[PDB]
Amino acid sequence: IETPITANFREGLNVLQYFISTHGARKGLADTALKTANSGYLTRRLVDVAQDLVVTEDDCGTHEGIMMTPVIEGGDVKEPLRDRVLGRVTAEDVLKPGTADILVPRNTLLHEQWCDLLEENSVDAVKVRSVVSCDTDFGVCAHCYGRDLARGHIINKGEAIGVIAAQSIGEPGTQLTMSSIQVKNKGSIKLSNVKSVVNSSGKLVITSRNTELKLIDEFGRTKESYKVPYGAVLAKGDGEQVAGGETVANWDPHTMPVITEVSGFVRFTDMIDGQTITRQTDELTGL
């Protein structure tokens, strides 16, 4: 509604203002009164499949597991590597940015001290042991799972993981009822999987879809991630150490080009008029 309630509770309301607010009030009551049943059904379905996930071993001695990365993509770093790996166990000999400096013999309990040691360094990716990667039959092993959250130590055998996990992810169910690229901070611009090419003005432009923009800090870890489409125009090259607040990448939201990576004469080939193409000319420019 474009007519707001200009008054407040202290000054009282008009009859029509209260009537309008009753819309939102009743809708808010309605969604709460309805969707809790879907929440309960979700919890039941979740815990049904999580019946028999119980620890059977401590360590199955499996191979490497899952690579881990922060969530810097899209916007600001929301969850850093500090908390996303706190409580996990590595799957390979992770080494510091200084080569041949290893902190883990392919498995260790990443408590707060190891986390501080790694965040002091410029590490940005670690191989950690996952539940899915576990090789144990009819169960999972503790070292493939990680330390407990209720106690803080490594999980001892006997308890059930499926039921607690399903309850954990089902409890908040009732609470969740409802053209240009500008760099924000100083860093080095890196291109991920780039098919670079040089435009007519000598700048750097892109000819692929699988390229990403990365902001590398002084340490080496990426700070920001952004998406650049195919056939876009960039105002900067790769490996440029630039400050924030500059429009670096430009592309038309609608016009998708077919830009040619090579240079040479352009004669109309395979262009037969009257069978595949139509003769239309711009009525203002003529080109």
Binding site: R151, G152, Q167, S168, G170, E171
Partner: protein, 250 residues
């Protein structure tokens, strides 16, 4: 079975069995009556329909209704669905040695819950009988029953230490996550409502506006050990979902 008002009430399975046996013996008579084959085909059709209705009434054709024009509950309906034996009688069951009350706030310690005296003797009544027998103040069990019916001072003398060091489980429907069940050490209070330590309220997502509470008591020694070592509120500080505390003042 008979009712108090001189009437009777029975399961519709009786009606289904009566119908099937009636048309079964009717077909038995018709077979040796050498009736025309049309009537035999009709009787066989209705025999099949009746047995299908018995196995699953509202499955193959029109559901066979009773005197109250309602569909009859076949034995399959008793084994499936939310109302089947699996969900409301096998997984979740009614339980004994329990009580229900209203919740209220308390000065209590973190591991203490205010249990009113009136329900205390009712819950631990078998324990009172046993302790009174061992203490020698009651010659026979029914004498102890009379004594607890008379609520003499001796029964409270027994209560003050029978409940001591004997945890009691507390539940608040609905139980969303693991923290919905908490073991507290009982403390006798002279009132009617269950007194609750305020800090645990956020754990229960419970507010003191008339919400009801359920109390259960463990019997065997293993149950008491599990309640004390695992289910005590002191053991539960951090969420299983994530390691942040749950006892933050509200």
């Amino acid at each position: 079975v008979p009712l108090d008002g001189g009437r009777f009430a029975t399961s519709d399975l009786n009606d289904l069995y009566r119908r099937v046996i009636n048309r079964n013996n009717r077909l038995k008579r018709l077979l040796d009556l050498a009736a025309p084959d049309i009537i035999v085909r009709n009787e066989k059709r209705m025999l099949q329909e009746a047995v299908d209705a018995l196995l699953d009434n509202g499955r193959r054709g029109r559901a066979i209704t009773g005197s109250n024009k309602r569909p009859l509950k076949s034995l399959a309906d008793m084994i499936k669905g939310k109302q089947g034996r699996f969900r409301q009688n096998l997984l979740g069951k009614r339980v004994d040695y329990s009580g229900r009350s209203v919740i209220t706030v308390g000065y209590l310690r973190l591991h203490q819950c205010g249990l009113p005296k009136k329900m205390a003797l009712e819950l631990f009544k078998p324990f009172i009988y046993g302790k009174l027998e061992l203490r020698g103040l009651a010659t026979t069990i029914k004498a102890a029953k009379k004594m607890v019916e008379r609520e003499e001072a001796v029964v409270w003398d027994i209560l003050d230490e029978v409940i001591r060091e004997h945890p009691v489980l507390l539940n608040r429907a609905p139980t969303l996550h693991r923290l919905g069940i908490q073991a507290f050490e009982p403390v006798l209070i002279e009132g009617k409502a269950i007194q609750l330590h305020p800090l645990v309220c956020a754990a229960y997502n419970a507010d003191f506006d008339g919400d009801q509470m359920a109390v259960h008591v463990p019997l065997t020694l293993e149950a008491q050990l599990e309640a004390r070592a695992l289910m005590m509120s002191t053991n539960n500080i951090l969420s299983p979902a994530n390691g942040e505390p749950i006892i933050v003042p509200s």
